[PDB]
């Protein structure tokens, strides 16, 4: 993981 978004 460690990224963000919103997806």
Same mark, same amino acid.
């Given at each position: 993981? =460690?990224?963000?978004? =919103?997806?």
């Amino acid at each position: 993981x =460690y990224x963000x978004x =919103y997806x």
